[PDB]
Amino acid sequence: ALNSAVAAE
Amino acid sequence: IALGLGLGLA
Amino acid sequence: MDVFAKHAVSLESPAVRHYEITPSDSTDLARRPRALRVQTGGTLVLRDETGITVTYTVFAGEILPVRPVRVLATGTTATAVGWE
Amino acid sequence: MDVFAKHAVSLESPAVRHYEITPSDSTDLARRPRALRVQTGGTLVLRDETGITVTYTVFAGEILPVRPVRVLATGTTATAVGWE
Amino acid sequence: MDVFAKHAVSLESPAVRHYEITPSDSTDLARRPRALRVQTGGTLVLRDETGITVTYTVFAGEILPVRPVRVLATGTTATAVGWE
Amino acid sequence: MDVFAKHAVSLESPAVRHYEITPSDSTDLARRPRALRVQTGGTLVLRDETGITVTYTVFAGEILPVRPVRVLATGTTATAVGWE
Amino acid sequence: MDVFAKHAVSLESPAVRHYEITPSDSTDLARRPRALRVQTGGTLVLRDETGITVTYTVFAGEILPVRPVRVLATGTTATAVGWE
Amino acid sequence: GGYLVDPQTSETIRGVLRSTASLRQIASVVNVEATSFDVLVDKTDMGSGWASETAALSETATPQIDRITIPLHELAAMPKASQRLLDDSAFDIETWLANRIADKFARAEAAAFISGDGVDKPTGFLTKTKVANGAWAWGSLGYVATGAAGDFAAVNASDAVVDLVYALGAEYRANASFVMNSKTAGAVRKMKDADGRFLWAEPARLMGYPVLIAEDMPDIAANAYAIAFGDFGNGYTIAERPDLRVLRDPFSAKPHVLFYASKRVGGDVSDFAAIKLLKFAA
Amino acid sequence: GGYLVDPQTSETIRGVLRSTASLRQIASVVNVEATSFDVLVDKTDMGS
Amino acid sequence: GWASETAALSETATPQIDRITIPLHELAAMPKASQRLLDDSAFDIETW
Amino acid sequence: TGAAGDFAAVNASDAVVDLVYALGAEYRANASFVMNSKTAGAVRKMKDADGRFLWAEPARLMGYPVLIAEDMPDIAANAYAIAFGDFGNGYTIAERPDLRVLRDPFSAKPHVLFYASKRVGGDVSDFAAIKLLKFAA
Amino acid sequence: LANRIADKFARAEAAAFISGDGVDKPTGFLTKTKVANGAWAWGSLGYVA
């Protein structure tokens, strides 16, 4: 549940 | 140790 | 103080009570022992509950795990103390 | 009076009934014993239920916890009494 | 590192703790032992919880599986170490 | 006729089957024995399942409750018969 | 091939693994043994988990079912091999 | 052609299923919307006389009262979820975090009910000035020792447990339970008799009493208290607010959301006679 | 501002919980509004 | 956090996400039956 | 387990009891052993020193179900012949719950040549919910 | 007080039901002249050793 840019998050 | 007849350790 | 109280005393367990046996020859033992600690060496005779009785050429410090009903006096030259 | 009556007699338990063995050499024992109290020293031969039979160089007061089917008479120089 | 930890120590089990016994004569043992490893040969006397006490003509390396309450000093010529 | 049939043969129980051992020194025993009845006195070597193998200065009638995988022939001067 | 595999190895059971002991004096044993097969005769000292440590006047082929934590080197004149 | 596949996704974003055994399912939970809960116990009892016909009764003693204060601390997490994610992420992230935050709170306060000190967290029953049982006072938890320093006793193992049970009083044993961790129930299950068959014959009960497998009691150390046993329904009181106040703040970090969730929970022992412990010292 | 909080007391005053195993639940309770009660047992039996 | 009363609560962690793909393969069987059997063999061989 | 072939010689039944308690009290809520036939037999043949069996229809072991899956490896050098875990969360099966069959009277002409192919797939989803029991050391 | 007295009475009368003597309190079943079982009369309670 963070930035939708980095896939791991 | 005790009074058995059994070829055991103890 | 015994830490091994509340443990059941089985047949394989060590000797709790002892009593010297006299070879009555005509009456059975008061309690039949689990084993016989032999006091002095010799020959002594032992009877089952089946009557089969034989002679044992026992030795002095020998401790023999036989459980006899009657210890006779005819061939008995060895004094013992019964363990139970 | 036995306080250890109502206890089950196991294989590890002391000897309840005894009987002297004769080396028949052609028939099995009437009862196979739990152990052999040796009467006099010598060599005696013992057979399993598998036929493997060997010779034991036993000693006089020796008590050996082997459970044989047949005690032969060919190599037997030592008399014993079976425990059970 | 003991692999036989978590096993219950029974009466038939090997000796876990040992302590040398002194024949007090007038007081009981602090712990009653499962067996007596005899140190030196002689005669020593042992008492049950029933008072029956007898004399044992014990030998040096002999280890006798009797479980006594009190070891008296009158007839005791043999030092022992109790096993438990 | 065995009255102790239907009893399970445990490790502590008396010897049911016996077989003389030969010190192969390169192969394991066909059956690993519960104990070793020593036939003649000497030194003999015994191996665990862990490889630790040591030499035992055994005596003639000695019966030693060790359960070996392999009996080697290098230091073996004592013949034995395995009990099981 | 062991027919007594799948049996649990208890304290009363025969020796599965053996290892010769060296009297370190200052460190405990790597494994505490169920018994001590004595190699050569002498006196050797043994310590419990309670510190009580005494001296045993042991004999050569003697096998003593005591379960020690530490074997010291001060009074030790007898080499042993621990059984487990 | 492989571009026309569109792998299907899950329905709900799953997660590692961590332990929820929290001591909250056996303790006394009391919902209070205040700053402290003041439970009132009666550390003593009354007196009776067996009067005669002409006795001219005198005064009988009256129970004296003790007050315990539950300070009701709070527990807060603030996960910062991006705003571009919350609207582009067909799952429901708002209710996932709230479901996941309440999971972390029920798992963080679970450790505080056991080994939590007093500073801004519930005082666990393990930090309550343990006294050797038999010399038991009211302001202390009574423990029984096993014997050897590390493990159970060397000779009469499982007797430090069977007397731990019968040292607790007939009335609290009616509904009591052991409390251990996963590694101690294993160390108990491995206890075996002189033969090798272990001597203890979905609650994973022991000796007939339930066992709450916590994950926060100390291991079997030199002098640790790895096994507790008692009626935590009367021995431990939890005060809390039974909700989860989530304040989403799209303001501080502007292109994000910054959920601020916080629950308030507290608790101390209410009945020092209703929880018995097991020390491994001697 | 810490004077403005007023801790919340419990609903009922709890107490140390003592053994109620009383032998009253395994015996024969007989409500009697008198000075005494006389059970009449038969210490023997008849003969056939 | 176990937030205090006056602490200025800062950022806390966030669980990370892993996606696992299940390629969903297929499993094929092709038995061959004679048309003469399917007409003469009263057991429904089609459904068997 | 200890020994390289079978259970520990000194103390067996502990490589099983610590396999159970190596999962976590949440996955043990509904977990089950998975063995083949001749392994549950080797576990049931386990007897203590006296000769009685230590583990006294679903073949439940230590209070937990047992799934007799014929495809696990047997007891061997380094085999993981016993797996224990909560597969409800650990292993996800993705499938189509129907079998599509295509009877084909054309390819082999005097025959009919059925052709049936369901689609299924799946691997583990929660690595924390499956623990194994290696038999090596 | 009534809930606390009704408790102490249930706990004070339970003590008299076992070891309480005759004076102004129920006679417990222990104060009834126990006799060895086998020599069992009616005015007594049998016991085994």
Residue numbers in the entry:
A (entry chain M4): 89 to 97
B (entry chain F2): 2 to 11
C (entry chain E2), D (entry chain A2), E (entry chain D2), F (entry chain B2), G (entry chain C2): 1 to 84
H (entry chain J4): 98 to 298, 305 to 385
I (entry chain K4): 98 to 145
J (entry chain I4): 146 to 193
K (entry chain I4): 243 to 298, 305 to 385
L (entry chain K4): 194 to 242
From the publication, what sentences describe this entry?
Gene transfer agents (GTAs) are DNA-containing phage-like particles produced by some species of bacteria and archaea. The genes encoding proteins that form Rhodobacter capsulatus GTA particles (RcGTA) are derived from phage DNA, which has been integrated into the bacterial genome. Here, we use cryo-electron microscopy (cryo-EM) to determine the structures of RcGTA before and after DNA ejection, and to visualize the interactions of RcGTA with R. capsulatus cells. Particles of RcGTA have heads with a diameter of 38-nm and 49-nm long tails.
Unlike the phage heads that are isometric or prolate, the capsid of RcGTA is oblate with the shortened dimension along the tail axis. The organization of the RcGTA capsid is derived from a T = 3 quasi-icosahedral lattice; however, it lacks five hexamers of major capsid proteins in its central part, which results in a shortening of the head. By contrast, the quasi-hexamers on twofold axes of the oblate capsid are bent to enable seamless closure of the oblate head. The quasi-hexamers on twofold axes of the oblate head contain subunits in three conformations: two subunits binding to pentamers from different directions, and one binding to a hexamer of capsid proteins. The surface of the RcGTA head is decorated with eleven 70-Å long head spikes attached to pentamers of major capsid proteins. Each head spike is composed of a pentamer of base proteins Rcc01079, and a single subunit of head fiber protein Rcc01080. Base proteins attach to the capsid by the N-termini, each of which binds to axial domains of two adjacent major capsid proteins within a pentamer. The attachment is reinforced by the coordination of a cation.
